[PDB]
Amino acid sequence: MSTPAVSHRFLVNFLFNNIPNPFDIAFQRISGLSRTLEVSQHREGGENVRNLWLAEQVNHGSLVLERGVMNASPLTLQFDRVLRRESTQWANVVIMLLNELSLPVTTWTLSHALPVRWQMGDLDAGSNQVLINTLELRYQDMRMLGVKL
């Protein structure tokens, strides 16, 4: 059987409408994409032994990203504009894992992602650590691709 996919190589591509060039930014800690369907349980009168689950509404999670405090990229300059309320532009994000050669084995492809939260790491006098800042986006739809679905 083919070997499963490990989780320490990944590219992320962003495409805003403010910014003319699509840019690719390296992260440390992409959190993880959930997708819940939100059923509800109904209880019938004469039926006491089975359950009844009724499908309603697909809920998508959130894209939480982590990287170090490095030079100003086109994405930390873009969260600065949205969190100062100077723009409300959102982007189409493409996230993909890479195998041993270079090849994309799975792709996640988020749509209309909106920057909603910046979170700075701690400043501590005895710490021995890189200052990590936490970024967080809310998207509208999600569409996973690739050969390793």
Partner 1 sequence: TMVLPGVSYNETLLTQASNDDPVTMPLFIGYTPPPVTVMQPVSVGSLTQANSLFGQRGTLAYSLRHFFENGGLQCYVLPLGPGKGEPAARLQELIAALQTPQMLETLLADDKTGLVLVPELSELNEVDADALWYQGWQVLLTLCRQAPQRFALLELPEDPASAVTLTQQSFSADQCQRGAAWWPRLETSYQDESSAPVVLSPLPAVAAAIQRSAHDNGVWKAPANIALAKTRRPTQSILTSQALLDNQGVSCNLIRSFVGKGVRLWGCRTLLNEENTAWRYIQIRLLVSSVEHYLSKLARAYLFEPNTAPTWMKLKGQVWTWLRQQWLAGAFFGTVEDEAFSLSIGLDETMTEDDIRHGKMILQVRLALLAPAEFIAISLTLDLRD
Partner 2 sequence: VVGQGYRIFGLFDGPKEKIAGTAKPDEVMEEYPTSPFGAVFYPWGTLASGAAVPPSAIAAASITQTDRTRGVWKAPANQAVNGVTPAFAVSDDFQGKYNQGKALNMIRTFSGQGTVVWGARTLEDSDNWRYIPVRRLFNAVERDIQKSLNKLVFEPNSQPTWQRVKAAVDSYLHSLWQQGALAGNTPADAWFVQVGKDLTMTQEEINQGKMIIKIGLAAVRPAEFIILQFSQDIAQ
Min separation Cβ 22 and partner 1, Å = 5
Q: Which residues bind partner 1 (CB under 8 A)?
A: 11, 13, 15, 20-22, 24, 50, 92, 94, 96, 98, 102-104, 107, 109, 111, 141, 143, 145
Closest C-alpha among 92, 76, 85 to residue 22: 92
- Here the tokens at position 92 are 């189409």
Give the N- to C-terminal CA distance of the chain in Å, as an integer: 15
* Shortest CB 87 distance to its own copies, Å: 11
The helix or strand, by DSSP H or E, that contains position 80, with its residue range, turns out to be helix 76-83
Residues 15/89, Cβ–Cβ less than 8 Å: no
Nearer to partner 2, 19 or 114 (CB): 19
CB of 102 to partner 2, least distance (A): 6
43 vs 143 by CB, closer to partner 1: 143
Residue 2: DSSP 8-state:
P
Q: Which is nearer to its own copies, 22 or 68 (CB)?
A: 68
